[PDB]
């Protein structure tokens, strides 16, 4: 089980996610913000 | 099980999320926000 | 299971996600605000 | 599972989503905003 | 299952999305905004 | 990815699959053989 | 990844799948045999 | 990950897999032989 | 990582696998055989 319970008043996020990705030949990959359950498979 | 309960006032998210792919061949991803529930399969 | 319980008053949210697909040869990938349960398959 | 509530007064949401294909061949991907359950296939 | 409550006073939305797809040769991808379940296959 | 070899000699296949659907209202799904890739989504 | 890789000589299959709905009132369901790759929803 | 190498000779398979859905008012689920890869979200 | 390696001579498999469901109201599940590599979200 998982419950995820945010009671709040003047709430604030900042997500900054990034990647550079130079010279590559091959990716596998996610990214993403505020994920409710569940799973990733690389 | 997963439960996303989000009770609130005056809230703010700023969510930057970005790649910079150069020289690459291939790619295999997934780039989002706020996914409910579920999974990503790379 | 996922439920999305989402109560609120004065919400702002910013959003801002770009990749930048330079010498490519292949890209595989998809790219999304706000996804409701499921799945990405790369 | 997925259930998405949504109560809300004063709501505001800047989705800005891009990418640049420079120098490529070939391109699979999807690109959206707000997607009500389901999936994509890469 | 994916259902999609939006109970709302005084909502603004705004989406941008766009791709620059310079010296390609092939392009397979579908861009829209809030789709309403389903998928896409690439 | 998927990838599905099948090299062979003397082969035999037996597929049979039926189902029986007394006394109801509704029905939603889906009956076949042999799908190369992708989704079903009831 | 999935790779699929069946090199043989004199193979038997037999597959049988089979159900009985009485009394029902509503079917979500999918009934196949051999998938290659990807998912079902339901 | 996932490589499936099968190498063989003089080989027999027999599944047989059936469900009895007797008074049901509801049905979610997915039923097949022989899946490469990939999921199911119930 | 998940390898599957199945060199073989004279092999028999004889998978059988049933439900019976009587008085049910709702039913979330898979039945399946031979599944390579991924999930299923339940």
Chains 1, 2, 3, 4, 5, 6, 7, 8, 9 share one sequence.
Do not use: T
């Amino acid at each position: 089980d998982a419950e995820f319970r945010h009671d709040s008043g003047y709430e604030v996020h900042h997500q900054k996610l990034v990647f550079f990705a130079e010279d590559v030949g091959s990716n596998k990959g996610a990214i993403i913000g505020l994920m409710v359950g569940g799973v990733v498979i690389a």
